[PDB]
Design a protein around this nucleic acid. Structure first.
Ligand SMILES: [Zn+2]
Ligand SMILES: [Zn+2]
Ligand SMILES: [Zn+2]
Ligand SMILES: [Zn+2]
Ligand SMILES: [Zn+2]
Lengths: 155, 114, 209, 150, 97, 252
RNA sequence: GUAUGUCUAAAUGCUCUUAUUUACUAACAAAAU
């Protein structure tokens, strides 16, 4: 979230109900945002991954309540979007087909990657597993370096 | 970083008096500062002969000497100093004293003036 | 202008498509310590750990070696060994010096042997020549412990000095030892005369220092 | 009849921290009880004399290998006595974080007691009953005892 | 504080050194004079350092005393100095541990 | 049998894996991570950890995926990743060695570039030019805290530590040089051993100086400069010849 | 413009003295009514 500066009205109707759920998130974030003296690259990456997951989760919760459950007013949702709470682009992506389970947006920036493609997470476990079986080796990848996303795919 | 530097950085806890005291405590232990024959750069006013190898070190020739305090002062409250030198060729310790009665120097078992 | 990378068949992989990136003046070559383009390939897409080129193309050419494997381009043998074989039928002296190594690298002579390996004529001839040329218990009475251990295992801590020639095997089990005896180079418990003498001599030698 | 939870923390049970006496802004002595958490090369010490005030002071850990002191005791004027294996004692100033002194006590036997509010000297004791002030020895080592504390 | 020595023994530097000694245990056994009477050094590490320093000194002495003007009296003097150094070293190899 | 012995490892947990440097100098240089403005301190300090491999060795995240290279940290005995480590945790067996024997010229069993020239002190990660399986052991006086031991005992200790770590070819303690030469079958194994035993105490729990093993300086484990005395040389030559023969056979 | 170079194996607190400095550096610059 951003800081309130009397720009937007404090909150629409149903914020008081959801606020305590997404205020747990804030605590988690706070725990995350600090020097965990990781002393090690992988460990360091893990905290970032965790943070990313947390970010995703809040958005999902919001998204779930507004679209799937539909228990929150449109206005409130809009307000949330305007604030830093939800991710707008991510939500949009989710709403689109084939991107519903989506760890993060930068796992589908095809420009970013060295090989002109999407993140592996986006490959359904099924396909990778099949490939592995064909080869001889076991399941090859666990989670990507952008965000911890073991089997991000929509399956 | 620059020779005319106004203020040297101090740590956030630097009780200056305390620091000084500490330094003093670790000055008796210290190697340099707790010794005699502290170095100096000086030209030679006497223009003299090195007594061992007869090397004729002339007037105004520059040397990295050792200045040491002579405990026995001149009169009362005006100090006199031993000023060690080495001859260029042979490494014999020449030196001289500054007795200010004549406004001049005295040779000290090093060489002879001529 | 740049020459091409010299990566061997076994080095590179078993597949009909590999993607690699070139990194111009990536690293310094290990031999020469002189900037050169790193090629680094992943072999199969998903198979972990990259294969970066460790040497400059020029150096590879000189030694006639894979830029990854550091093995003969032709026979896939360590430079020493390949060169040694040739000698047997003169070897390279890489000059391990800051300045001189670079100079050596820049020279283009094919150091030593490399020429022979390069040419079908010469390598083949060498090979032919080579072919022609070819055509608890103490233990007493040199060979390595990894062989001894293997032997013991087959028969089923294992100390062995060589100056002594006195191998005190300690299975630490009465079962293992009693199986070991029945299932079967002097081997007691915790030209024989000659052997004894030799052993004694060895012991003496061990004990004088 | 009523109790409340004031504090929960981790600590290092093997760091023996002796309770130090202290005089009030009135005229009696309060016992301060103390706990030490040694983590990430820092020492953390949660002290109290009663339920009203709980203080935690942080100090670096002077040892370069980051090994834990066996015994820690307060001395006068922010002095902190830190006993390390091999009978080595580091006096640290708890306000400056400066190392003041490093003393190696001359005893083959493990130091088992170290106290600083005895006030120019501290007292130490061997597991064999050598007692010294730091200096002089008031009692020599016996062969027939072992102590673990004092 | 020209000529470097002064700078070295300037108060700030001394303070810094002291701080280092306090926290972490950086001493410069080059910087302090080695003590005369051993057995006023309960720590082993310190003793070892001292020994090392004396060895270094001895080595230095050795390096210079084989200079070409061998008949000069400085060399002769050093010969005694060398002996003294050796003696010191020997002493430092005491049998407490 | 590391596979069926265990899965888990967790050698030294990520709470306490290491403090970063040890104070030489006055000030700490952020770019090199090394203390500056002074150099007083013998620097080599004994490892707080060690590889008790029978206990530790296990399946890893690497094993499943098909990693070649073994875990340096595991060898040292401080791999906080443990089962989620991508590098292998076991003593290099023969099969593994065989598998990575193509790459073993250019880089070690740890997947890190062997150099063209040896380090002047023979101190780390050997050259690709000279293949080697032969480790100089040194600072055994310092590694045992200046203990008055029998040379034989020392040798035995060395054997105990090193046999566990890899398939031994042959070992020699020397009184005169005050050293321990070890030779292995496989270069990779030797490398692993070196990694393990760098800065390690040779002492045991049963010894009286166990609690002050940290205060000493560890084993100085390095690469072996070939033995000059003639029998050894002859043996080496013979070995080389054999190797050559094998190569020839392979070729034809 | 505070030069430089070689050389290197891996007792504790205490206080009292000052209206100063055994101070060091000279690369920098040099005239009269
Ligand atoms: Zn994903
Ligand atoms: Zn993602
Ligand atoms: Zn991804
Ligand atoms: Zn290759
Ligand atoms: Zn690991």
């Amino acid at each position: 979230p951003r800081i309130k500066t009397r720009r937007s009205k404090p909150a629409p109707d149903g914020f008081e109900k959801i606020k305590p759920t997404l205020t747990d998130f804030e605590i988690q974030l706070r725990d995350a945002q600090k020097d965990k003296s990781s002393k090690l690259a992988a460990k360091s990456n893990e905290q970032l991954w965790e943070i990313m997951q947390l970010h995703h989760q809040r958005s999902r919760y919001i998204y779930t309540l507004y679209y799937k459950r539909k228990a929150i007013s449109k206005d409130l949702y809009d307000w949330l979007i305007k604030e830093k709470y939800a991710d707008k682009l991510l939500i949009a992506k989710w709403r689109k087909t084939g991107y519903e389970k989506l760890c993060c947006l930068r796992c589908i920036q095809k420009n970013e990657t060295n090989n002109g493609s999407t993140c592996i997470c986006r490959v359904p476990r099924a396909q990778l597993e099949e490939e592995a079986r064909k080869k001889g080796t076991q399941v090859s990848f666990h989670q990507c370096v952008h965000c911890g996303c073991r089997g991000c795919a929509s399956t | 970083s620059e020779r005319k530097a106004i203020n040297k950085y101090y740590p956030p806890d630097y009780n200056p008096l305390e620091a000084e005291k500490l330094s003093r405590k670790m000055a008796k232990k210290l190697k340099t500062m707790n010794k005699s024959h502290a170095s100096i750069r000086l030209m030679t006013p006497f223009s003299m002969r090195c007594l061992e190898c007869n090397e004729y070190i002339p007037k105004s020739r520059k040397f990295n000497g050792k200045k040491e305090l002579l405990k026995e002062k001149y009169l009362d409250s005006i100090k006199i100093y031993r000023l060690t030198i080495s001859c260029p060729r042979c490494a014999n310790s020449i030196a001289f004293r500054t007795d200010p009665g004549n406004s001049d120097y005295v040779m000290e078992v090093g060489g002879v003036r001529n | 202008n740049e020459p091409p990378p010299n990566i061997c068949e076994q080095c590179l992989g078993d597949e009909a498509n590999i993607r690699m990136t070139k990194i111009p003046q990536g690293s310094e070559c290990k031999i020469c310590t002189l900037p050169f383009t790193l090629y680094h390939f992943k072999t199969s897409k998903r198979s972990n750990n990259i294969i970066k080129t460790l040497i400059c193309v020029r150096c590879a050419t000189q030694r006639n070696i894979c830029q990854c494997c550091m093995l003969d381009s032709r026979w896939h043998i360590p430079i020493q060994l390949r060169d040694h074989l040739i000698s047997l039928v003169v070897m390279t002296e890489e000059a391990k010096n800051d300045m001189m190594k670079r100079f050596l690298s820049l020279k283009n002579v094919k150091l030593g042997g490399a020429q022979i390996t390069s040419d079908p004529s010469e390598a083949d001839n060498i090979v032919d020549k080579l072919k022609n040329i070819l055509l608890s218990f103490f233990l007493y009475n040199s060979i390595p412990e990894w062989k001894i251990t293997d032997t013991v295992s087959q028969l089923l801590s294992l100390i062995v000095n060589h100056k002594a020639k006195c191998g005190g095997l300690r299975f630490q089990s009465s079962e293992l030892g009693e199986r070991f005896v029945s299932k079967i180079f002097i081997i007691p418990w915790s030209t024989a005369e000659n052997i004894k003498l030799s052993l004694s001599l060895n012991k003496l030698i061990q004990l004088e220092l | 009849k009523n109790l409340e939870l004031l504090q929960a923390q981790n600590y290092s049970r093997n760091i023996k921290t002796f309770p130090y006496k202290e005089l009030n802004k009135s005229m009696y002595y309060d016992k301060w009880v103390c706990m030490c958490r040694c983590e990430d090369g820092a020492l953390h010490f949660t002290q109290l004399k009663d339920s009203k005030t709980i203080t935690t002071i942080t100090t670096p850990n002077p040892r370069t290998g980051g090994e834990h002191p066996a015994i820690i005791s307060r001395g006068p004027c922010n002095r902190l006595l830190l006993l390390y294996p091999g009978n080595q004692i580091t006096i640290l100033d708890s306000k400056t974080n400066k190392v003041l002194r490093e003393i190696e006590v001359d005893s083959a036997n493990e130091i088992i007691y170290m106290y600083g509010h005895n006030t120019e000297y501290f007292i130490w004791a061997d597991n064999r009953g050598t007692i010294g002030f730091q200096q002089y020895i008031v009692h020599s080592a016996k062969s027939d005892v072992e102590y673990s504390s004092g | 504080m020209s000529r470097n020595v002064d700078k070295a023994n300037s108060v700030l530097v001394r303070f810094q050194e002291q701080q280092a000694e306090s926290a972490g245990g950086y001493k410069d056994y080059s910087r302090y004079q080695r003590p005369r009477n051993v057995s006023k050094v309960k720590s082993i590490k310190e003793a070892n350092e001292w020994k090392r320093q004396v060895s270094k000194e001895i080595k230095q002495k050795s390096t210079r005393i084989y200079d070409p003007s061998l008949n000069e009296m400085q060399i002769a003097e050093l010969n005694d100095e060398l002996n003294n150094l050796f003696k010191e070293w020997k002493r430092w190899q005491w049998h407490i541990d | 049998s590391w596979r069926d012995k265990s899965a888990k490892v967790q050698v030294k947990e990520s709470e306490l894996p290491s403090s970063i440097p040890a104070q030489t100098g006055l000030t700490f240089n952020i770019w090199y991570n090394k203390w500056s403005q002074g150099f007083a301190g013998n620097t080599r300090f004994v490892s707080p950890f060690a590889l008790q491999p029978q206990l530790h060795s296990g399946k890893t995240r690497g094993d499943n995926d098909g990693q070649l290279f073994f875990c340096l940290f595991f060898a040292k005995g401080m791999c906080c990743l443990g089962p989620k480590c991508e590098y292998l945790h076991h003593i290099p067996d023969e099969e593994d060695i065989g598998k990575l024997a193509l790459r073993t010229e250019v880089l070690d069993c740890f997947g890190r570039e062997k150099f063209a020239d040896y380090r002047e002190d023979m101190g780390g990660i050997g050259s690709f030019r000279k293949k080697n399986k032969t480790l100089y052991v040194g600072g055994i006086d310092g590694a045992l805290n200046s203990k008055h031991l029998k040379p034989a005992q020392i040798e035995s200790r060395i054997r105990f530590v090193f046999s566990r770590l890899g398939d031994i070819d042959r070992i020699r303690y020397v009184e005169s040089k005050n050293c321990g030469f070890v030779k292995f079958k496989y270069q990779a194994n030797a490398e692993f051993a070196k990694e393990a035993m760098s800065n390690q105490t040779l002492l045991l729990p049963s010894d009286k100086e166990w609690d002050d093993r940290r205060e000493g300086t560890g084993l100085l484990v390095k690469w072996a400069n070939e033995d000059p005395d003639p029998a050894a040389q002859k043996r080496l030559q013979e070995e080389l010849k054999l190797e050559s023969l094998n190569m020839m056979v392979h070729l034809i």
